[PDB]
């Protein structure tokens, strides 16, 4: 615990300088998420305050690309819900509580400009999908069908590439990998049902072959998702 | 799936058959123009005889 507190203090001191904070922001994209997880797990007021200060310094306006860093953190590390949970939780330390409130306000301001499309884009870039509410939201798919097909179906091509990578990674058949594969299959089925012009692009890019290969997967959920995608493709 | 790939080939064959069927309609349209030209040629020949008269 003492070593972790000293490391957090050193990280905050380094992040005090905006140049060093900006350099460390790109050094580890998951550093903010790890710090937030440690702050949530740790019950020490001083450690939580140090973690909050370090997180704020990374997203501070002094550091370069402050808005971009804040948006990336809120999109990838789920900064906004974590800050909302921390604000709901009661902290004995007054300085730590004030830092948590400031971080929550910053996260809310960053998420106000952001939308579900930005979150979907970040999830696609990170190649991580865990059945997001936009995936199961019919209205979100209806309002984002044109966006997916935009730029010569750039989003559709990215989804096809992610599905191909998951199929290549399907040998491991990990639980997270299986969930990602199922989410990708559901997204492909939605993008085929709505604006079927992307179906031809997916077929040219081997999306149909990937779905057929996933139809023989050992996992029951993956097989069911692949069967549903095939039915949406040419099935009744 | 190997069977699914064969089904895709059947779909491609159906698309090829559909393209051939569409080509047959285009070929019929091309033959339709030739048939109309023959009818026009007969009328032109009759008109030429009237001009000669």
From Swiss-Prot, chain A:
Effect of inactivating the gene: Increases the ATPase activity of membrane-detached V-ATPase V1. Abolishes growth at pH 7.5 and in the presence of calcium chloride, abrogates growth at pH 5.0.
Cellular compartment(s): Vacuole membrane
Functional description taken from the UniProt entry: Subunit of the V1 complex of vacuolar(H+)-ATPase (V-ATPase), a multisubunit enzyme composed of a peripheral complex (V1) that hydrolyzes ATP and a membrane integral complex (V0) that translocates protons. V-ATPase is responsible for acidifying and maintaining the pH of intracellular compartments. This subunit is essential for activity, but not assembly, of the enzyme complex. This subunit is also required for silencing the ATPase activity of V-ATPase when V1 is detached from V0.
Family membership: Belongs to the V-ATPase H subunit family.
Additional information: Present with 22500 molecules/cell in log phase SD medium.
Subunit-level organization: V-ATPase is a heteromultimeric enzyme composed of a peripheral catalytic V1 complex (components A to H) attached to an integral membrane V0 proton pore complex (components: a, c, c', c'', d, e, f and VOA1). Interacts with YND1.
The name this protein goes by in its record: V-type proton ATPase subunit H
Organism whose genome encodes this protein: Saccharomyces cerevisiae (strain ATCC 204508 / S288c) (Baker's yeast)
Organismal lineage: Eukaryota, Fungi, Dikarya, Ascomycota, Saccharomycotina
